[PDB]
């Protein structure tokens, strides 16, 4: 990992933000060399990302480099599409929508340059309609370029070019899975399918699709434009790259910054800009993932670098790429229930473990917080959480327990004493 | 809230502005043919827009356009959130309350 | 005609013996010497059922709202 950073220069993977929002020639960075890329054999791009080997921003492992050079090697009778989440499911994510808001010109390229690797046919994106204003403008960004003849059907210089069809959702979590999105792109109700039909690259719209994420297809052109040997810059021999973090919930100026891997949380939280709560003596009870990781106390987290597998060393890792912390007044038990009260409303409801199994917790979590009937429950409530893992289809269950699974870990007494606080009270 | 209708506007009636029948040419244009059969997500919502909340005769209408048995619509409008089945106001306001927002 | 219990003769009327197989089934009708009849065992077709054929390009089997 080198020098234990993760610095930020003007040399980064994102071109500009406050400079130019509208259309043009991509005055400096973008749309630079194209006809040379596409005219060379497609699999040249395939595995040429391996110089980086992006883990992927979809909240998981499984480097993006494999799945595209993965099946969808051949082609037979039926077209292939691209479905790239723009959605945000996790509370406090916020990383998305900043990419789109002030610089859309990147991703329409990101597909066209990207889609050629798939050998795909069309391009769908998807956006939660809950963003009405910013998402409305992409069409202009599509038009303001696409109208110039930059895309389709040969554009430019190849015999292969195809346009991008925006769509919208409503009350979606649906980006909560692939093999759901490709279902509610269709117009059924969205109940995500079983994971191994034929996994997500066989059963699809009518025909094989691949579900990418935003900065997985956003940073691909610039990492195939230059690459290197700088493609692997920071992070150890395992995880490599520089992703975006967006700090939220206590800071001086919670705001995004581009930061490379293996950055410790004690300098990163304090920096960009201040630590404005107590940098210490505010107890710094932290959540690595947005909703997908339980607490860490004042322990090795602060020296624990943000590298992925570095976090699996602790009791939980995070792929979500977000930060929420706390200081003093926020009662964690009080502040984790409204993370659970959230889950109960976003779940499909097919499976018997998820449905009727999350409420069993959510109905009891309003006992502990309020303070109420006796311990030895905690010992059970742990087993429930241990009882939903292989039992649910999607990850929302595997992402349902961890907050409670990792609350019972790391804080014993805060509960034990409160059940007394109402016990002595009853007396 | 309850998800059954007490026969409010079975015949409201309702209809689309003839300015809107020229866009639905473009929406279906998106998809491939023969699977079309659901554009329902924009088309059902565009109807909310023309009105501002969609009564039960709005749910029955698009079926006559899209030829799907109109329990393959009443379903989709009771799953998502953004659609408002009951009437609303001029401003429908949201307060984000979640772990960070808390 | 006192209560409505349905009283009866036909003193067998309730016996079910249980054999293990046909070859040894008829074995006990002859050996005790009364008339009889036979039915046949039934088991289903093989059969062919595959999930994941339910989402189809040109096929006519394509389910909605499952």
């Amino acid at each position: 990992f080198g020098s234990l950073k993760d610095e930020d220069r003007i040399f980064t993977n994102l071109y500009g933000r406050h400079d130019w929002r509208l259309k043009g020639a991509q005055s400096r960075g973008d749309w630079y060399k194209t006809k040379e890329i596409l005219l060379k054999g497609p699999d040249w791009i395939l595995g040429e990302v391996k110089t980086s080997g992006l883990r992927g921003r979809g909240g998981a492992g499984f480097p993006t480099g494999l799945k595209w050079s993965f099946m969808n090697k051949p082609s037979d009778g039926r077209p292939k599409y691209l479905v790239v989440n723009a959605d945000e499911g996790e509370p406090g994510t916020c990383k998305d929508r900043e990419i789109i808001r002030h610089d859309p010109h990147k991703l329409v390229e990101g597909c066209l340059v990207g889609g050629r690797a798939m050998g795909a046919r069309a391009a769908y994106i998807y956006i939660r309609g809950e963003f009405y204003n910013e998402a409305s403008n992409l069409q202009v960004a599509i038009r303001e370029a696409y109208e110039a003849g930059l895309i389709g059907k040969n554009a430019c210089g190849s015999g292969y070019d195809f346009d991008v069809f925006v769509v919208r959702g409503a009350g979606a979590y649906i980006c909560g899975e692939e093999t759901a999105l490709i279902e509610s792109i269709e117009g059924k109700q969205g109940k995500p399918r079983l994971k191994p039909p034929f996994p997500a690259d066989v059963g699809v719209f009518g025909c094989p699709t691949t579900v990418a994420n935003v900065e997985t297809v956003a940073v691909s052109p610039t990492i195939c434009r230059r690459g290197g040997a700088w493609f692997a810059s920071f992070g150890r021999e395992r995880n490599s790259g520089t992703k975006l973090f967006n700090i939220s919930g206590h800071v001086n100026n919670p705001c995004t910054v581009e930061e490379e891997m293996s950055v410790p949380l004690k300098e990163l939280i304090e920096k960009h800009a201040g630590g404005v709560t107590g940098g210490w003596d505010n107890l710094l009870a932290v959540i690595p993932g947005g909703s997908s990781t339980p607490l860490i106390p004042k322990s090795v987290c602060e020296t624990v670098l943000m590298d992925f597998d570095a976090l699996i060393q602790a009791q939980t890792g995070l792929g979500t790429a977000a930060v929420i912390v706390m200081d003093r007044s926020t009662d964690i038990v009080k502040a984790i229930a409204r993370l659970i009260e959230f889950y109960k409303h976003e779940s499909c409801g097919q499976c018997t473990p998820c449905r009727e199994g999350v409420d069993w917790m959510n109905k009891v979590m309003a006992r502990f917080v309020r303070g109420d009937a006796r311990p030895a429950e905690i010992d059970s409530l742990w087993e429930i959480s241990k009882q939903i893992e292989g039992h649910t289809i999607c990850a929302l269950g595997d992402g349902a327990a961890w907050p409670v699974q990792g609350l019972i870990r790391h804080f014993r007494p805060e509960l034990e004493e409160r059940m007394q606080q109402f016990a002595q009270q009853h007396q | 809230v309850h998800r059954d209708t007490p026969e409010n506007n079975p015949e409201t009636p309702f209809d689309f502005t003839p300015e809107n029948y020229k866009r639905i040419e473009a929406i279906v244009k998106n998809y491939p043919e023969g699977h079309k059969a659901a554009a329902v997500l924009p088309v059902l919502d565009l109807a909310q827009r023309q009105n501002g909340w969609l009564p039960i005769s709005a749910m029955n209408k698009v079926a006559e356009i899209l030829q799907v048995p109109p329990m393959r619509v009443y379903e989709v409008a009771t799953f998502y959130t953004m659609y408002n089945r009951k009437p609303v106001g001029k401003y429908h306001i949201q307060v984000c309350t979640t772990t960070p927002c808390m | 005609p006192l209560m409505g219990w349905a009283s009866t003769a036909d003193p067998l009327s309730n016996l079910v013996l249980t054999f293990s197989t046909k070859e040894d089934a008829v074995a006990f009708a002859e050996k005790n010497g009364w008339s009889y009849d036979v039915e046949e065992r039934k088991v289903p077709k093989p059969k062919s059922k595959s999930y994941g054929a339910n989402f189809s390009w040109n096929k006519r089997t394509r389910v909605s709202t499952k």
Binding site: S136, Q139, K153 | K22, R23, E25, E33, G34, H35 | -
Partner: peptide, 28 residues
């Protein structure tokens, strides 16, 4: 900013410039 009026957005440049579609059939 335009609360209603998705029209020309959907029906002006998109309507003419979304070719063909072929899209096939699927009769069914």
């Amino acid at each position: 900013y335009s609360t209603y009026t998705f029209l020309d957005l959907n029906l002006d440049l998109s309507k003419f410039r979304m070719p063909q579609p072929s899209s096939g059939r699927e009769s069914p």
